[PDB]
Amino acid sequence: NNNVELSRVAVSDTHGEDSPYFAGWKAYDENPYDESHNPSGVIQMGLAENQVSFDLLETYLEKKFRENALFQDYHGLKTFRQAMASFMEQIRGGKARFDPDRIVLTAGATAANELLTFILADPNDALLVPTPYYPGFDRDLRWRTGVKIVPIHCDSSNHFQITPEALESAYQTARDANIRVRGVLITNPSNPLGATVQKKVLEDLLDFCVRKNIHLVSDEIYSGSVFHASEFTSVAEIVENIDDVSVKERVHIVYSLSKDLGLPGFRVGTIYSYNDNVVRTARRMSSFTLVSSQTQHMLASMLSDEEFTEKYIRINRERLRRRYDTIVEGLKKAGIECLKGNAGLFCWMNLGFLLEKKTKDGELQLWDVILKELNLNISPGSSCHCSEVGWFRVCFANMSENTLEIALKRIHEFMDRRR
Amino acid sequence: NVELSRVAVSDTHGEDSPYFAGWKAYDENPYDESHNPSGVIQMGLAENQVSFDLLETYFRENALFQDYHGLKTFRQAMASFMEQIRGGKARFDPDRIVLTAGATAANELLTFILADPNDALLVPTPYYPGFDRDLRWRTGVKIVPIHCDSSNHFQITPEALESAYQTARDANIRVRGVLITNPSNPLGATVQKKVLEDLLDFCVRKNIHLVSDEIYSGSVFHASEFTSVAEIVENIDDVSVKERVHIVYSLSKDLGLPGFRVGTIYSYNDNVVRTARRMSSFTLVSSQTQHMLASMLSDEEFTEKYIRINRERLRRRYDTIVEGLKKAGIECLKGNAGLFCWMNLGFLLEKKTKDGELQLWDVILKELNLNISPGSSCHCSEVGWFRVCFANMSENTLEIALKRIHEFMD
Ligand SMILES: Cc1ncc(COP(=O)(O)O)c(C/N=C(\C=C\OCCN)C(=O)O)c1O
Ligand SMILES: Cc1ncc(COP(=O)(O)O)c(C/N=C(\C=C\OCCN)C(=O)O)c1O
């Protein structure tokens, strides 16, 4: 006899925890920085969390049960989905409108993307994802679904943006390889690039999805963190300009309050689908990952406070843009370039010029030095499947001004030695 | 036009079914004491309101906490709360507690961990209709029934386990475990300690898993009649036996908090613990909710008394409905736990068939404006049985519902 057996999924490494993204976070837990009693400790810059605006929520909740405890309906509180739909309209500046009856809540966007993948792709089918992308997709999209990721290659020529030749090449290469493609999943604005997607690129992408008869999933979890509202194009805007419901039926939006509101612990995700069958199916499936009715009830009033949401979103954009400029201008003093970003909680930092040669193990060696001599946890670009080595994602939104300044000192101090 | 996955177009969502057709019909004309007492009274939903008044009489760091270990305070509260429910007959290490969004998530997640697509789990009939979705819809895993009949109050026998296993072998389906409900839904009955030990020996001999969904453990009328598989493991000394036992629990039924989506897996298998915790990223409990409940669920004073009083009211509510149904000439199976009774209407049947049972089920939904669950939606092997929920309603509403059934038998 042998030890009682677990499933293939259970012994698979697709949980993604043998990886630089997880090891650097682990190195942070063993020696965390602290201004007062460990200024030599590891500064956490590898986690995309937003604390720069959190005082607005603290100030707001200061100034202001049986029903929710019994409410477990898979639609979610009608009151909260109105708050969510209105909050999403405010993020997009009225260039889109959201019917609360189409809102499906999930425990964060982690749940939403896996759920949508269950709905749009069979096991052994594939989704196209532009590189570089959020390492967590390698778990979220694949671990339990049997679905595969086919990369859409992007390089620095066009600032890592989708080109029609890369969409056609990724699709056709897979189709010639007897891999069935079911859709494209994009991050808009991008993680890890911190960059909006240009409107015409999204329009060509939607046209491409029509021509191949595939789906378009747009993960817009950083939409409220675009530095300037007018530079963001949600796929909702491209679809609102179309009454052809035959076209609408393939577009789905993933959103979450984890990044824009800085509430990751509350696990508020949503799917907004223009496909009525996906809505009905996603909602039944959300039974496996429902949002606490307590937090829905708490957040509903705050997220419907049109006065407060207008102010929060405006101010959150400015503080993130302000941190982006702080860190990008700090790195330029040290002789380090970043991609020009216009959104998100992270900058995309080019260190390829410090490498042995453009190889993967050279990037990890450098990452090891930044993690052990500089005591900074940042994410190596190859764990985001970047096509060029030496790029690093650096998060700037989860820390105090001074902690960012000290982190900048260590890097500036490190470049002086290497010259 | 776009294609969706087989999972998306599948019937396994289970809503083209009487359990959800009657729950539907309730929404179109819902009862309300104030402005519609002729409306549909909901008796098809196992929810517990009878003890909620006891709860009523009783930030930056939380918002940022998204760790899949869960709050340590809340894992401590859950573990001590689960020990109090079992009367100290078992001990729960808070470090092994894995939280999920309800037991709905927990059973599906465990199914992902314990069985491959196209393998099977054995499930005793009758069983919770939601399992037909939860264990199968996204997992590709099959349910092979363990048949039970009324001769022994629908309890598992060593023989039924073995022929059920043989049935899967004939279909070239590999059995990976048995999932039981302890106490039973829809029977409302504890499982005898002897039966659980014989079940565990069967799982050892076939080297398969045993999942015990004990979401109704706090609703056993007389605490000593309940045997958790945790008590049986507490006194086993072979690790080969322990390693296959996993407990699912939730605060939805015993505490009446279904909306907060607090589920847990307590597994005696360290790799299931670690895998369940990684997999719980897809279905985490709100940290706000963990925090609020940690203080309440660690107040052993309040919890010891809450558990005691909830047992007494569910027993009396059980007595109210079963004695109400007997007055109308209807027998219920002898139950001792849960939020529902198991009602035999087999004598009003047109043809001792499944078609006949649903036809009769249609009458109670239309004419009586009562949603109750037909036993064939629980895969009962005998026709004419119905699950009737009694804890999701007021005193007044239950009396009104009984009166409607009483008149129908006239
Ligand atoms: C593009 C994208 N989608 C979904 C998620 C999941 O977020 P949720 O709504 O479940 O809270 C992330 C989280 N981004 C990160 C994940 C951090 O770990 C926590 C995962 N919940 C990151 O550091 O890049 C993300 O970047
Ligand atoms: C044995 C069992 N396990 C798990 C669950 C789900 O519990 P939760 O996910 O809240 O922790 C139920 C709910 N059973 C019912 C609840 C249904 O509500 C709607 C979802 N089907 C029922 O009517 O039998 C159950 O009976």
Residue numbers in the entry:
A (entry chain B): 13 to 76, 91 to 445
B (entry chain A): 15 to 72, 91 to 442
The publication says:
The rate-limiting enzyme of ethylene biosynthesis is 1-aminocyclopropane-1-carboxylate (ACC) synthase (ACS), which is generally believed to be a single-activity enzyme evolving from aspartate aminotransferases. All ACS proteins contain a conserved aspartate aminotransferase (AAT)–like domain and belong to the α superfamily of pyridoxal-5′-phosphate (PLP)–dependent enzymes.
There are four AtACS7-PPG complexes that make up two dimers in each asymmetric unit. The structures of the two subunits are nearly the same, with an RMSD of 0.44 Å. For the active site, Asn217 and Tyr248 both form hydrogen bonds with the O3 of PPG, and Asp245 forms a hydrogen bond with the N1 of PPG. To estimate the role of Q98, SAM-aldimine was docked to the wild-type AtACS7 structure using the program AUTODOCK. The result showed that the amide group of Q98 directly approached the sulfur atom of SAM.
